Structure formats: structure tokens, C-alpha cells
Design an enzyme around this catalytic site. Structure first.
Site, PDB file in Angstrom:
ATOM      1  N   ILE A  92      -8.425 -23.307  -5.432  1.00  0.00           N
ATOM      2  CA  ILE A  92      -9.575 -24.195  -5.608  1.00  0.00           C
ATOM      3  C   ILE A  92     -10.736 -23.497  -6.317  1.00  0.00           C
ATOM      4  CG2 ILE A  92     -11.558 -25.092  -4.327  1.00  0.00           C
ATOM      5  CD1 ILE A  92      -9.778 -26.683  -2.599  1.00  0.00           C
ATOM      6  N   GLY A  93     -11.062 -22.291  -5.858  1.00  0.00           N
ATOM      7  CA  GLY A  93     -12.137 -21.510  -6.444  1.00  0.00           C
ATOM      8  C   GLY A  93     -13.353 -21.403  -5.549  1.00  0.00           C
ATOM      9  N   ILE A  94     -13.301 -22.105  -4.425  1.00  0.00           N
ATOM     10  CA  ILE A  94     -14.451 -22.212  -3.540  1.00  0.00           C
ATOM     11  C   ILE A  94     -14.180 -21.660  -2.150  1.00  0.00           C
ATOM     12  CG2 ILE A  94     -15.859 -23.778  -2.198  1.00  0.00           C
ATOM     13  CD1 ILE A  94     -16.082 -25.602  -4.477  1.00  0.00           C
ATOM     14  N   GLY A  95     -15.044 -20.752  -1.714  1.00  0.00           N
ATOM     15  CA  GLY A  95     -14.967 -20.221  -0.371  1.00  0.00           C
ATOM     16  C   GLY A  95     -16.088 -20.754   0.495  1.00  0.00           C
ATOM     17  N   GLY A  96     -15.727 -21.316   1.644  1.00  0.00           N
ATOM     18  CA  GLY A  96     -16.704 -21.837   2.579  1.00  0.00           C
ATOM     19  C   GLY A  96     -16.313 -21.569   4.018  1.00  0.00           C
ATOM     20  N   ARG A  97     -17.290 -21.665   4.913  1.00  0.00           N
ATOM     21  CA  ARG A  97     -17.047 -21.498   6.338  1.00  0.00           C
ATOM     22  C   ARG A  97     -17.267 -22.818   7.067  1.00  0.00           C
ATOM     23  N   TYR A 110      -4.053 -18.830  -8.262  1.00  0.00           N
ATOM     24  CA  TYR A 110      -4.960 -17.864  -7.656  1.00  0.00           C
ATOM     25  C   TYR A 110      -5.175 -16.653  -8.561  1.00  0.00           C
ATOM     26  CZ  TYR A 110      -7.459 -16.045  -3.567  1.00  0.00           C
ATOM     27  OH  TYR A 110      -8.430 -15.604  -2.695  1.00  0.00           O
ATOM     28  N   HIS A 156       0.819  -1.213   0.000  1.00  0.00           N
ATOM     29  CA  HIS A 156       0.000   0.000   0.000  1.00  0.00           C
ATOM     30  C   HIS A 156       0.854   1.265   0.000  1.00  0.00           C
ATOM     31  CE1 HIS A 156       0.579  -0.616   4.362  1.00  0.00           C
ATOM     32  NE2 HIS A 156       0.389   0.685   4.487  1.00  0.00           N
ATOM     33  N   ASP A 184       0.217  -7.927   1.801  1.00  0.00           N
ATOM     34  CA  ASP A 184       0.531  -6.504   1.758  1.00  0.00           C
ATOM     35  C   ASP A 184       2.039  -6.266   1.697  1.00  0.00           C
ATOM     36  OD1 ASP A 184       0.110  -3.775   1.686  1.00  0.00           O
ATOM     37  OD2 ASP A 184      -0.061  -3.577   3.868  1.00  0.00           O
ATOM     38  N   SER A 215       4.991   2.238   8.145  1.00  0.00           N
ATOM     39  CA  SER A 215       4.702   1.068   7.264  1.00  0.00           C
ATOM     40  C   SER A 215       5.871   0.680   6.402  1.00  0.00           C
ATOM     41  CB  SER A 215       3.506   1.387   6.375  1.00  0.00           C
ATOM     42  OG  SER A 215       2.342   1.449   7.193  1.00  0.00           O
ATOM     43  N   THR A 227     -10.851 -12.238   8.369  1.00  0.00           N
ATOM     44  CA  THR A 227     -10.440 -13.158   7.319  1.00  0.00           C
ATOM     45  C   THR A 227      -8.942 -13.102   7.041  1.00  0.00           C
ATOM     46  OG1 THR A 227     -10.897 -11.491   5.616  1.00  0.00           O
ATOM     47  CG2 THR A 227     -12.677 -13.010   6.180  1.00  0.00           C
TER      48      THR A 227
END
Lengths: 296, 4, 296, 296, 4, 4
Positions: A222-227, A293, A59, A89, A164, A147
């Protein structure tokens, strides 16, 4: 009382580490500028090795027309953006110096402990190199955001804008981390005190090595976000390797690639390590080919 | 939420 | 330079004391909640002895439908409110553990000195156990409020919301006090930095012992508040043991109960110690029967 | 674990230095007051030597009808304003004490180093003598203002209103500087943390000596302000010794009084040292008679 | 003011 | 700007 006595001081750490810590200027043209460079943002940076590779926050250097690096010894260089990673970052700069360059002391065998005295080195408000003193308040912190983990070191060494990309070191001068974030969330509108975060040095190193080798950091996706024993699926990305694996939303996932799947963070880290294009077993047994990714 |  | 050297660290204090410091959650039902528990307030707590008695601030556990205690080792208990005292802002919780419990190191013979390095242990903003480092800035502080003494320790170890009820320890890990209050008063609207207060451990102990023995803290109460050789009377409480002693507003008071009365704070402390229902001599010679301090 | 151990403490520094640090009250009459003294401002002060000379900030004692000095031992004196200097924001007070006076330890041979542990001693918000702990963050700082140098020490020892005029000492208790200013400038409206400035002790001493000897500080004054090899002239003061030397705006200046002129700050310092009324050579060769710096 |  |  007379004094042949020696004042308690962290000067040794300062003398070992400070020279390697640099002032970083992000300069950009303005519609206002009319062809004149102005400072968009300013921060710090750490000289990792004598080749002239410097670590800093992403940043700090984002959308820079020009990047200027200034050493404490007076030298000034224009910097070359080797690469950056939004996820950690981090960002790597290259300066070319025929003359010798100061480097930040690194001890890869050193284990940062909670309660270790640390010094924050940086350029608060562009006042010039400032040294503040605190301790390591915590390790493995996810930061303010819920997250993305990222294993932040938490320190109460005073951190301000301009800090920073600067270094966090112990009394020995060894690099502990890269100062990145300061906690600002207010409950009842008060101002948080002595809560700042640094990227652990071990992680900083790995990310730097990958950016030097390739223009970017490469992670299997993977392409999949889950909790979240097991881990359910909350969303499958449209047109995803996922969708292409034809995965079905919500199917719990017990294990993957010859390994158990109790912690999602552990699982995602494993997914990141794996090379893009590879196909692995998953427990819900459906085959899927990972792609690198998506860029951010 | 975790994306990977 | 090479390093077989040892980093300056307060880890030892951290390892001795941190395990005993717990995360305290005040959970309450909401009209909004519709039968679902939500966090009203969160703070810290200290495990005083292996019986499972925990010290914390009263404002942390006030009006709690449920109180949850979480150790750093992972264990979670529901907590029983033994008692509380508004005057010292203290409160005692009971958790039942068949397994061993960590306890905060206590050295009753230890005298806290101004300039002693101290660590604040607590749960700022619910980020997880944080360790901040400062010194003892002062002792015997009355706090922000002019009234009520309370012998606060003042520290510049960083204190934030969630730190309340947590421990203040020295480099040896010995308990110095219970972090309670952070100075917030602004002159010209600025934000006070590095000014926080802790209940001295010696006082914390005495209050805990009294709450464990009885549901409340018991103090002898004259019924009369006045402002200061001698001490005048500015107000006699209506229908007070006072009024019942038929005391007259403003009569200076030289001495009481075979003792001199130069300092009001010294005098009130004496009054508090005395058992309720007792009658003692007062110098203005009028007899009066003390009643226990009215609840608040 | 049992403890015959010794807690890490800066009490020794506290015991050596704190007694010399005094509470300073600037009291003034108000149209509101109707003949009653009220506190305009409050700060701290340092007892420099047993004659009863005290250093403090000028802004602390400005426009005072009465100045009250309070020692930690209980003694209270009315103070006599020896002199003040707006340029260094210093001021000297005189109290007359037949009895012995505590003095701040001074080691003129001591060189303050970046990373030296330091203690700030003062009277924040009039709570009573507070001790905060930090390090020397930097030296030779110009402060928040771009103009006027002044060689500030920068410290992250917590500084608040009331700290002004107080002492900054090392672990040995030796005077490092006089706490003066706290950085408050906000980028994005945030509050700067752990950034405070102190007048270096060496400078404080010289200024005190000059104020004790004469009612004011005396500096040679050219009359011309300009911005920078050589140094150009941007403005000549109207009716100035300057104008009287008939200097011409903008003529670059290579050297002065048998010496080179590369740094303006170095040049001005030289000008200040020189006695008023003296005439010296200047390189642009025009003769000019200096007058003492105009009062402010 | 002190109450006791 | 420097004045002296």
C-alpha cells in the site's frame, strides 16, 4: 537392581532428523584476508527436499563471498543462494548432489502444541552438531520486536550462536520450525534463560516455495504505515502509490477489498497476499493501485 | 507502528 | 517413515493449569507520570479457587497504587489486596467475577518428588504466558538466604523476571508450588543456570487461608534471636516480651512448652504456631508472655 | 478432572543414583587462616564400588591440605588421595567405611545415545544435592580446548560450579559420565546456555582402575609433538627419547609398530597404551625407546 | 542467626 | 598441535 530396561531417549527423533540438519558457513574475503577466505558467520540449515534445497536464516548468509554447506555424513558442498527475505529472516540455498540427500521429516497435517517436547538441532559455537531438549513454550509470538508479527514459536530448548537456521523437531522427528532468535534483553542486567524463537514450519515452507519459484518474495504494498472500531493512518509514504492515490494522513479505515478492517495485522497480511499492480476498494472510497513491496 |  | 504416532507432550498439563495462571500488573503513579499510571513491576498469579482469590508474590504487588489482573481468556480485572506476608513473600488478591473462573488443579494428597517433571507457567518479560519445562531439583531448600528456612522447591525449569507469582505444576497439571526466586549469586562472575525456587503448594495454601481469614499472618513472637544439645541466646530484643520476661542473654535452652529443643528451626516454628498473649514453660524455668510477631 | 494418575518423574533414577553421589570439600590452610581450615574449592564425587573408592575431578582436589567427603545419608569421612591425572582431569579418593556404602549403578554394556534423557547430580554453589534434567547433546566431543581429545559427552542438563566430579545418569539411573566442564567462551560477550561436558563413564572406569593399581596413570611417551596421507613432525623435545632416537623434525610419518598412521589421535592413543621402555618400528626406519609420559 |  |  538389574537392567534389561530401556532408557528414556529422544534418539529416534535424532536419527530421523539430525542427518538433514547441516552446518552452514558464511565465508568472506577480508582486506585483512589478502585473498584468503575467512568465516564471517556460521549457523545451521535444514535440507527441505531431495532436490537439494536448504532453508537457513538470512543473517547467516548475508554478504557472503562464499557459502559452504557441510552434512553430518561428511559431504561438503558449495551452496548457491536461491533467494532471501529480510522480513522473515529466511533464505534458500541450493546444493547439487547426484547422490542421495537426507531430508527433514515434514508432517503438514501436524499441529504444534504448547507443551510438546522438542529438540533443537544446530551447530553452537561450531562445536559440531548439538542436540538440546525443551518444550514449545508458546506460539504466535511476535518476537522481541513489537513490529512485524511473524508468528514465532517460543522454546526453552537451549539455543546459542550457530543454532540459527537449524531445525526444531518434536519427539517424532517432525519439523516444528527454524531456530532463529534468542531473547537477550536485560532488565537489571540479568541474562534471559531458556527463551528462544523459531519460525513456524508452515510459514518456512511457504516462504521457501516462493523463493524457489522467484528470486524474491513478492508482496503487495500500500505504501502507508499507521497505528490502530477501525485503523487510522499515521504516515503516508512520499511519492507513494499512496501519495499517488492521494491518500490523506489519518483518515480512519473501516474496511478494505470487500472485507472489514478491525485488526491491522490481519489487514496487512491481506495486502501482502494481493498481486502488485491491482486496484482495490478501501473504506475510510478512494481507488489505489498497489505496487510490490519495496526491497530491503 | 505497522507499515504495509 | 510415516506418522500416525503421537508426539511426546505436556499439553494436557498445560490445558489443565495454564488458564488459571494470570498476568499481574503492579501500576503506580510517578512524579514523572503526572497523573498517569505506569508499570512498576509485573509478574504472575495463580487462581486458587472460584471465589476469585489469587496467590502471588508480595514483591510483585508491593507499593502498588493499582493492581491489574489479566486472564488468558481476555478478561481483565482490577484486583483487591487481601493481605501480604514478607516472611513467605506471599500475597493474596481478590477479583470479583460473576462469570466462571478457571482454577489451578490442586491435589493435597500429592507428594512432590525429586525428579518429577514440572512446568513453570508465567509471564517472562511480559511476552505473554510462557511455558518452560524442568524437574524438581530439590525440596526443603532454604533459598539463597541462610536465614528463615521456607522449604523452597528447587527447579531447573527456566525462570525469568515476570515468572514470580506464577505456578509450578507436574505433568498431571497439579500445583507443585509458586515460583518466587531465581538464584543469581556469582562465583567468579558467572551466571547461574537452571536454579530457581518455588514456595511449596502446601505452605502456599496455609498462608492463603490465613490471609483470607485475617488481613495478615499471625505468629507468636518470643522476641529473642539466638544461634544454636541445646540452643543458646545471642540477643534479647530491647523492651521485648523477652526483656519483660527478663530473659538473660546466652542462657542455653534445652526445651520448651512440654517439648525438647534440639533444632532451632523446629523451635521457632512451634513458637510461631502458638497464639499471641499465651504464657508457656521454657527450659534454660522462667515464665514469659508471647506477643504477636512485630510487623515488617 | 480427578487424578489417580501418575506424574511423569525421574525419581527412580534419582533414588538409584543420588545416594552414591557425594559432596566433596577441598580444605586448605591460609596465611589468613592462621591454623584454621577453609574451603578452597567444592565439588561432587561418585562412589564407584563398596571398597570406598570415589571418582572426582582433579581440579576439585588440587592442592588440598584436607579432603572431606559427605554422603547424603549424613556420614562424613576424611578422604585419602589415591591418585590424579591432569590429562583426563580425574582423581580417585579413598574413604574407609566399615558400614555399607552406596554405589553408583554401572552398566558396562550400556551404550549412551544422543537424545537419551540424563540427570546431572551434584552440589551447585554448596546448596545441597541438586538434580537437573537434560539430554545427551553429543558424544566424542573434544571440549572447549582444541587439543587432547578426551571424548567428552555433551549435555544440556544444567551444570554449575560445584557440579564438577558429580554423576551424569540416564532415566534408569545408570552412570553415563562424570560432569567436568561447562562451556563459557563468549562471542559478542553473551553467556552460553545448556552446554556442559562429562567424561564418559567407560573412560572414567579405566582411569580409576589404573589409579587404584598405581599411584598415577602410566602412558608411553614418544617425546615429539606434530600436526598432521600421513603425519609430519613439528617439534622434537630437547634431550628427548626422541632426540635420543635422533629424530629429525618434519619427517612425515606413514605408519608405526606394524600399523598405519593416518589419524594422529589414533596414533597417540596407541603410543600411550604401549609400555614405557619398549622399542618399536616407525615409518617416516629408525628405532626408538619410549619413556613413560613426563609428569604434569 | 535465627529470630523468633 | 598434538603432543605424544
Amino acid at each position: 537392581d538389574s537392567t534389561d530396561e530401556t532408557p528414556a531417549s529422544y534418539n529416534l527423533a535424532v536419527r530421523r532428523a539430525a542427518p538433514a540438519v547441516v552446518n552452514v558457513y558464511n565465508r568472506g574475503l577480508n582486506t585483512n584476508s589478502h585473498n584468503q577466505l575467512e568465516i564471517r558467520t556460521l549457523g545451521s540449515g535444514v535440507i527441505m527436499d531431495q532436490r537439494g534445497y536448504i532453508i537457513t536464516n538470512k543473517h547467516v548468509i548475508n554478504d557472503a563471498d562464499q557459502i559452504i554447506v557441510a552434512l553430518q555424513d561428511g559431504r561438503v558442498f558449495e551452496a548457491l543462494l536461491v533467494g532471501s527475505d529480510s522480513l522473515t529472516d529466511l533464505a534458500v540455498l541450493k546444493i547439487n548432489a547426484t547422490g542421495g540427500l537426507p531430508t527433514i521429516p515434514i508432517n503438514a497435517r501436524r499441529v504444534p502444541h504448547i507443551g510438546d517436547v522438542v529438540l533443537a538441532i544446530g551447530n553452537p559455537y561450531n562445536l559440531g552438531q548439538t542436540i538440546t531438549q525443551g518444550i514449545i513454550s508458546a506460539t504466535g509470538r511476535i518476537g522481541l520486536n513489537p513490529t512485524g508479527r511473524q508468528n514465532f514459536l517460543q522454546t526453552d530448548a537451549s539455543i546459542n550462536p550457530g543454532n540459527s537456521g537449524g531445525a526444531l523437531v518434536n519427539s517424532l522427528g517432525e519439523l516444528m520450525g527454524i531456530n532463529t532468535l534468542s531473547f537477550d534483553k536485560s532488565n537489571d542486567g540479568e541474562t534471559p534463560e531458556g527463551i528462544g524463537f523459531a519460525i513456524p514450519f508452515q510459514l518456512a515452507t511457504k516462504i521457501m516455495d516462493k523463493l524457489i519459484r522467484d528470486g524474491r518474495v513478492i508482496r503487495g504494498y500500500i505504501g502507508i504505515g499507521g497505528r490502530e472500531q477501525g485503523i487510522v493512518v499515521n504516515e503516508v509514504s512520499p511519492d507513494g502509490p499512496a501519495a499517488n492515490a492521494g491518500i490523506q494522513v489519518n483518515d480512519l479505515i473501516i474496511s478494505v477489498d470487500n472485507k472489514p478492517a478491525i485488526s491491522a495485522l490481519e489487514t496487512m497480511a491481506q495486502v501482502a497476499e494481493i498481486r502488485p499492480g491491482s486496484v482495490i476498494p478501501v473504506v475510510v472510497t478512494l481507488q489505489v493501485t498497489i505496487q510490490e513491496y519495496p526491497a530491503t | 507502528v505497522y507499515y504495509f
